[PDB]
From a paper:
We examined the crystal-packing interactions formed by the polo-box domain (PBD) of [name] ([name]), a validated anti-cancer target, whose phosphorylation-dependent protein–protein interactions are crucial for successful progression of the cell through mitosis. We have observed an unreported binding site in a number of crystal structures of the PBD, which is formed by the rearrangement of surface residues involved in crystal packing. This site is located close to the [name]-binding groove, making it potentially accessible for phosphorylated proteins binding to the PBD. The new binding site consists of seven residues: Val415, Leu478, and Phe482 form the bottom of the pocket whilst Tyr417, Tyr421, Tyr481, and Tyr485 form the sides of the pocket.
We further investigated the influence of Phe71PBIP1 on its interaction with the PBD. The thermal shifts of 9.7 °C observed for 72-[name]-79 (lacking Phe71), and 10.5 °C observed for 71-ADPPLHSpTA-79 were significantly lower than the one observed for 71-FDPPLHSpTA-79 and showed no significant difference between the wild-type and mutant protein. When [name] is bound to the protein, the hydrophobic pocket adopts a closed conformation and does not participate in peptide binding.
Author numbering:
A (entry chain B): 73 to 79
B (entry chain A): 372 to 500, 507 to 594
Write the structure that this text describes.
């Protein structure tokens, strides 16, 4: 459920 | 056809059971020649409202909008490629474009800001290498699956940050592992020499993912 790639 | 070739390459390697080797010699399957020119470095799923934004490793940005158009900002910071729903490709600039494209360009800049400020560039250690766009994507609980217009399929796994970039023209796969070590293999050499359990598992999953792309055209 991440809404973006790795921070 | 790229996806069909990919499905064959993956059947072949997986049918060989590469991890069930007495002597795994995965290093001998590396082919540094097949390193990809392009992969997705960063992405932002804003699909509930706008689209899927992403950055390629060349620093170009792109968006697959919900209305099935695509806007690409080149790494010069001003050149655009636009793709209308009927697939017409055109060259424009942020400095000179139709007025009707302002909302889309504004959105792309917003996404590019978020990605530039807050997200890590996958494969930043790698020196890579025409500019592909995102043909299709989807997500599972496990991974995001990005299919580029040059036939490449990239699969990013959420839990452990591992990634596959499958290159059908080279019959190759690049695997970025938990350590961020990037190794590029020829799939037929993985068949001969074998590989670790973790990579064989990701390759089995990859075939299911290409099945899903082929079944949802």
């Amino acid at each position: 459920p991440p809404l973006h790639s790795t921070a | 056809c790229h996806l069909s070739d990919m499905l064959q390459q993956l059947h072949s390697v997986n049918a060989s059971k590469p991890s069930e080797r007495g002597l795994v010699r995965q290093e001998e399957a590396e082919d540094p020649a097949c390193i990809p020119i392009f992969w997705v470095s960063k992405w932002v799923d804003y699909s509930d409202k706008y689209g899927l934004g992403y950055q390629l490793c060349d620093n170009s940005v792109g968006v697959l909008f919900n209305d099935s158009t695509r806007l690409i900002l080149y790494n010069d910071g001003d050149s655009l490629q636009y793709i209308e729903r009927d697939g017409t490709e055109s060259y424009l600039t942020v400095s000179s474009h139709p007025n009707s494209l302002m909302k889309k360009i504004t959105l792309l800049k917003y996404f590019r800001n978020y990605m530039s400020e807050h997200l890590l560039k996958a494969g930043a250690n790698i020196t890579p290498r025409r500019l592909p766009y995102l043909r299709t994507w989807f997500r599972t609980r496990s991974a995001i699956i990005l299919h580029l217009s040059n036939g490449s399929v990239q699969i990013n796994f959420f839990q452990d940050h591992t990634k596959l970039i499958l290159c059908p023209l080279m019959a190759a796969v690049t695997y970025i592992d938990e350590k961020r070590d990037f190794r590029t293999y020829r799939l037929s050499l993985l068949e001969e020499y074998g590989c670790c359990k973790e990579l064989a598992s990701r390759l089995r999953y990859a075939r299911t993912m290409v099945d899903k792309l082929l079944s949802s055209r």
